[PDB]
Every structure is written in C-alpha cells, then in structure tokens.
C-alpha cells in the first residue's frame, strides 16, 4: 500500500518518462471483487500521454495505432522497479480500476 | 444491433480463427454511460483462446507474453468485415463490456 493520492504533475512527468519506447501495460477493472476486463502485459509504445482532471483523474495514452484510456484514478506510486502504478476505487459504486506501466513484464 | 445471444461453440470457432496471426483488439468497460477502461487497436497475436461459462460468458486469450480477459459477455456477431464483436450489459449493476477482434484497425 505505498499508494498515495495522485499528484497530477508527478504522474504526468512519470508518463512522459515511458513514452517512445516499448513498455508493458496492465489495465484491469473489477466490481462487486470479480474481474470484469483485464489486459496484462500488452506490449505497446505510446508517443503522447496525458493525465487530466482534478480528482479523480483520467489517463490517456496514444499508442502506435490505438489508444489506452483509464478514468477514475485517484492514487499512485512508482515502485522500486520504477513501475508506475495507478489505481482508483469507488466504494459507493463498487468499481475499481488499475493502470500500471513497466519497462519489463509484470509477474508476481 | 446484429448482436445475438452467444452460441458458445460458434464463438469458440471464431476465436480460433484469429489465433496465431496479428489482430487488433478493442476492449472497453463502461458504467452508469461513462467509459471506465478502454484499449483500442492494441495489436496482439494470441496462441490459445477459450470462451467459458454457461451464460454470461468469459473469454480468455493468451498472448505472446500476456493475457486478455473479459467476463460478462452475453451477445455477439461476426460482421460483414469478418470482425468478431462481443458484448455484455448488466442493467442492474449498470455495467457494460465490449471485446472486439479484427484483422484490421477499428475506425468508425
């Protein structure tokens, strides 16, 4: 739980860090928890990235020929492996989301 | 709305059709609708694929070095462009999901 409330500018700086080179992505949505949609270790290269909103937040990544988008993000951290981990959880709607970016495949 | 109730064996046959060659994927989850998670035109090559359950259904695709998974699918079709379109909608929980596979990028 090194997760901390999102600091917009720090996340933006972190996203630009991983732009223009191949990275692995984990994008998952859960509900009430049961998994709804899940993509793990999708390999992509994005050239533009932006975190928007004032809380919760939404992140959009423009890939080679597509898009990766996540809304409802409220917390994050950059771990010892330098992986940008972001997440959000709405206790009322019982909805959770996770978007993680790493230079290496996600395992355990 | 050419969407029709899922026929497990037909979907399975369709999934195996796109296995082992590069395809484009659209995977999206929405709620109450507002988009929650979205990946459009992710390019992947999956070697194993299976639709499970008895209704709703869940589809798992094993990619080169990751996974694509969607639960709550109830309807589908294969359109004129030979694209496998699948979706599910839970009016009670106000949750929707879409998983689409195509040999070409998704546009309009």
Swiss-Prot record, chains A, B:
Signal peptide from the UniProt entry: none
Pfam families for this protein: DUF1806
Query: What SUPFAM superfamilies does its record include?
Result: Hypothetical protein YojF
Which superkingdom heads the taxonomic lineage of this protein's source? Bacteria
Matching InterPro entries, A to Z? Answer: DUF1806 (IPR014934), YojF_sf (IPR036492)
Q: What name has this protein been given in UniProt?
A: Uncharacterized protein YojF
Q: Which organism is it from?
A: Bacillus subtilis (strain 168)
Gene field: yojF
